[PDB]
């Protein structure tokens, strides 16, 4: 019930919480809405759903860039490094975000505009063979009971990763991540003083996200062959 003072980290923690909430609405504070598109059986790809999904995906990528620019120090890195970090973690952050909007009761996920799709629709919107993997991840994430602070910190840790290849100032990146790592650990103990194992458990989730995002890249190639036009440009650049 007692904790040493950590004003600086507390402050950083507050800034990250706000960056996330402002760049990604909460599941509760939003009006959910559905669609009847190919909601019953699975199809190779439902273009109507894809249209909306790729649009929301483009917008969330933009939100993630905004989130990045709100992280103390991020803009202090070279533009090259900013781009490298964002390209390396964007899909991971996108997957984490949608999974935190999973509703197990109805087996659905809710996008930032309220669109709520069931598993079959998520599959038909473009998730394809990655659908069950993603739902499994979301189901296993719920028990961690992460809030916006923990989610934002995890996204920030994933993004500010000095291990990414081709960084101009990897060390400078490592320097930025440490406070975030420290802040997440302390904040976790704040909420759960009994679960001293929640920190490593949450950190592990990042590696879990990677296994899915690594496959997402392959899904891009397949999607390119299924859709009539070009892959939305921003999605192209991020997975490029």
């Amino acid at each position: 019930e007692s904790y040493e003072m950590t004003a600086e980290l507390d402050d950083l923690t507050e800034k990250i919480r706000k960056a996330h909430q402002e760049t990604f609405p909460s599941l509760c504070q939003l009006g959910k809405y559905t669609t009847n598109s190919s909601a019953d059986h699975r199809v190779r790809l439902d273009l109507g759903l894809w249209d909306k999904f790729s649009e929301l995906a483009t917008k969330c990528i933009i939100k993630i860039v905004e989130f990045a620019k709100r992280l103390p120090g991020f803009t202090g890195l070279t533009i090259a490094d900013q781009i490298t970090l964002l390209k390396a973690a964007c899909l991971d952050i996108l997957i984490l975000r949608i999974c935190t909007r999973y509703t197990p009761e109805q087996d659905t996920m809710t996008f930032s505009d309220g669109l709520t799709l069931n598993r079959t629709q998520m599959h038909n919107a473009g998730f394809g063979p990655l659908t069950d993997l993603v739902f499994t991840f979301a189901n296993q994430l719920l028990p961690l009971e992460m809030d916006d602070t923990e989610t934002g910190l995890l996204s920030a840790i994933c993004l500010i990763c000095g291990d990414r290849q081709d960084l101009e100032e990897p060390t400078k990146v490592d320097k930025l991540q440490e406070p975030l790592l420290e802040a997440l650990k302390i904040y976790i103990r704040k909420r759960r003083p009994s679960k001293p194992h929640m920190f490593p458990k949450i950190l592990m989730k990042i590696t879990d996200l990677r296994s899915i995002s690594a496959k997402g890249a392959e899904r891009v190639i397949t999607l390119k062959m299924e859709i009539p036009g070009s892959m939305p440009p921003l999605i192209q650049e991020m997975l490029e």
């Binding site: 860039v65 440009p233 991020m238």
Partner: peptide, 11 residues
């Protein structure tokens, strides 16, 4: 090249 991301990051 990442004309989109550059642009979004520069401003």
């Amino acid at each position: 090249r990442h004309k989109i991301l550059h642009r979004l990051l520069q401003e």
